[PDB]
Each structure stands twice: as C-alpha cells, then as structure tokens.
Amino acid sequence: YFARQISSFCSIDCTTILQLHEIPSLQSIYTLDAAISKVQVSLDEHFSKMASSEITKNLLPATLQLIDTYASFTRAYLLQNFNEEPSKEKLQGFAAVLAIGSSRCKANTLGPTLVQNLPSSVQTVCESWNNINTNEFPNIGSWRNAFANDTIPSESYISAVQAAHLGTLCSQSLPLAASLKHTLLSLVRLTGDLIVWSDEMNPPQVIRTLLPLLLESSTESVAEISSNSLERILGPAESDEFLARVYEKLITGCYNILANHADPNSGLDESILEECLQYLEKQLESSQARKAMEEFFSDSGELVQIMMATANENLSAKFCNRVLKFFTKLFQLTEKSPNPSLLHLCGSLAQLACVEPVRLQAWLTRMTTSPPKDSDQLDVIQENRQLLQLLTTYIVRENSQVGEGVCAVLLGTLTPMATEMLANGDGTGFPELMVVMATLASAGQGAGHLQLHNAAVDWLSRCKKYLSQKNVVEKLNAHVMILECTCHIMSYLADVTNALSQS
Secondary structure, three states, X not given: OHHHHHHHHHHOOOOOOXXXXXXXXXXXXXXXXXXXXXXXXXXXXXXXXXXXXXXXXXHHHHHHHHHHHHHHHHHHHHHOOOOOOOXXXXXXXXXXXXXXXXXXXXXXXXHHHHHHOOOHHHHHHHHHHHHOOOOOOOOOOHHHHHHHOOOOOHHHHHHHHHHHHHHHHHOOOOOOHHHHHHHHHHHHHHHHHHHHOOOOOOHHHHHHHXXXXXXXXXXXXXXXXXXXXXXXXXXXXXXHHHHHHHHHHHHHHHHHHXXXXXXXXXXXXXXXXXXXXXXXXXXXXXXXXXXXXXHHHHHHOHHHHHHHHHOOOOOOHHHHHHHHHHHHHHHHHHHHOOOHHHHHHHHHHHHHHOOOHHHHHHHHHHHHOOOOOOOOOHHHHHHHHHHHHHHHHHHHOOOOOOHHHHHHHHHHHHHHHHHHHHHOOOOOOHHHHHHHHHHHHHOOOOOOOHHHHHHHHHHHHHHHHHHOOHHHHHHHHOOHHHHHHHHHHHHHHHHHHHHXXXX
C-alpha cells in the first residue's frame, strides 16, 4: 500500500508548493493511517516475541518518502488556506518563513521571530492550525491493553482512528488535514521504530528528513518526534551533529529568505530580513555556526549574493545599512580574533570580483546616490556610504583574503559613477566616492594605484572642464558643488604627487 501511495505521488512535488487540489482526500490519508497502525502493532508484537531483515529494508525507504510527501500536504493545506485578504510569490515567501519557523529544540528564535512578523491574517491562520491537534485519535500503544478489545485489538484501534477522521470531517476549519497531522505523527513514530533496529537505515538521509520536519511550522505535530529521531541518529539535542544540522539548515533558510524572498512579491515584510541579518551576525559570533557558514560560502559566493540582493532598490536603505554592518563585523571579528572560517569568507568575496557589472554598479549606485525624495533619512544614507568605505579599506588591507581583483573591480565600477557625479554635477557623494576610489589605489600600494592615478588625472580634467564654465565662474565670483569637487580632485592629485616624490 505504501508503494502505491508513493507512486501516486509522482505528480506531487517534494521541494515545491503542492496545489490544494493535489492533497489526498481524507479517505487515502486514513486508509494510510490504518495500514500504518497495523504494521506498527504487528511489528511491535513480533519484536517483543523475539526478545524481518528485508522487511525493514523495504518499509524504511517506503515510509521515509511518505513522511516528506505528507509533510508537503500539511504545508499545502496550511499555505493555500492563507486568506487572500494570496499570490503564489507571496505564498512561496510565507513558505520559507514558516519553514524556517521552528517551534522546538535549540533551533533559533529566528524562526519564531520571522513566524511572528507575518501579518495578523497569516498569524491567526498558523495559530488556528497549531490549535487543532491529533487528540481524539487513540494515541500510542493503546493496544498495550489490547485497546480495550478482546483478543485481536488492532482492528478496534483502526476503527477508532477512522471515527476520529470522520469527526475531523465534521470540522469546518482545516478538517481534512486535522487528520493529515495524525497520519504524519504515526508515520514519524513508525520511522523511529524502524531506525531503532539498524536494518539498512541511511543515517544522513534520515537525519535530513527529521531536520526539515523539525525546523518548520507546518509539521509541528511531529516536531518532537523528529527531534527524537535526531537524538537517535545525530545524538543528544546538544550534540554537535544535531546542532550542526539544525543551524546549517537555519542558515540555509535565512539565506533563502535573504536572496530568494527579498522581492516584496514574496509578501514578506522587511522586518524578517533585518531580524535574520541580526541572527547571522549572532551565528558569526558562535564559532560552530560561523565555521559551517564558512565552508558553505568559501564554496559558493553566497555572501556576495547578500550584497547582490541588497542591490534590490525595493529594500530600504536600512537593509543596506544592516548588510554593511554584517560584513563590517565579519571583517572586524576576523581582525580581533583571526581564524580559518573568517579567512574562507574573504576567499568567498574573491568571487564578488566575478559579478554582473551592471548589477554591481546598480548596487554601488543605491549605496552612494542619496535621494531625499524616497530616503528621508539621508543620515542613514551617509552611514551606508561610511560602511562601504570601511569594507573597501578592509578588502584593500594586505592580510585581506578578498584578493586584489575584487578591489579593482569595485574601483573600475566606481569610475563611471564618479564621472556621472561630475557629468550631472552630483557634488554630494562625489568626495566620498573619491575617498573609496583612493582606497583602491591604496590596494595599489605595492601593486596598483596606477588605475587610480589615471582616473584622477581624468577627473581633474573633467572638473577643470566644468569650472571653465564662465557663467558658473561669475556665479562663484558672486556650480559651488562642482567647484568643491574640483578642489578635492586637486587635493587628491597633490597627495598622489607627494606619494610619487616619497617613492
């Protein structure tokens, strides 16, 4: 029966949101609960008597897949239930949020906090979902006393399970999956039983199953049971392996919200993003979480994606500010207490050297340009500029692991921005841009700076050109932004010639 159910699930997507129509009718869910109860009781009996090999061999893979599939069904019943007063985009977002949302184990308030930040409607929906439970059903080993049934007990137990399913039918709110939860619970208990005996259990695979089943809100009935399964394979809830999986998954989820749920279409308030950026700084503090994030990001430029996601303009300048601190504290923590994990994140920023130049510029633009029209907080825009300068200085340092390519990449991209700050006469920001460009020639100490020398020669040329406007000349005798830009360019040329004389 398990096989049948699995195969029927071929149309079902394990890692994707299932349409509310693809959730199985209560019938299948309960035929299943029944089959499960039966195998369970029968095997208990057999084992106590013993006090089969291929039996477990087959049952375990078969059960493992159904748990993950029914986990998606529980989510589908909860997610699609969200009241429109919702776009799939919004829904995919709420999804990562409630997934991350863990209500058990060490995990992290990260979830609980993100779960909370999900508007009144969704909050109430999740609340009602958790409020319903698998109570009327007869719970574990009730067959110890033969389930109050003469001789063969299993049948009466299955009948009571069916009666509880029919009572859930009566419910008008989330009635079908009031039984999905109990099916999931029975499945997780049977899976823990199969894990008990070694059989051929795939430790890492089962570990992953239970990790996702736990650090989630939809699958909350078995969250404890999944934690028990992890204690079984990962070890104590305070064992490294267990915590290792918990926090790794947590970061993966946060990251998913940071890069694949940044768009407002996900319906996710900016609060979630800021809260888990704080959570990521917190993990950087915690050595183990720091090192996991480290392997992962020296592996994939994923930290670059955070700043690349910050390029999103829909995100407030507060996001920019928050992102800058995170990296600020990544570089500083490295300076205060150097360790390989930190070396590896700077090797990760070397991947930033290879990014979409337009996207990088679009990001640099959002960071430097200060429009009071949308950003009433120009002071926060200025803090953003300062933190970008700090990050550039950190990358240009000799002991930095970001490499020289990234510095040049940033330097080159800023050149057009600087030119625009002189072409459209954007005096505001131009001086800071110049400062940052300078740090790139700074990286140019032993090797480099050449680029900056040439670029500065060119900027001098351009500021000269503008001032040469005699209308503006008369205005000044009586614009001023362009004049001060030219003055700063001349001062930087003076500094460059001083450096050349020192050489």
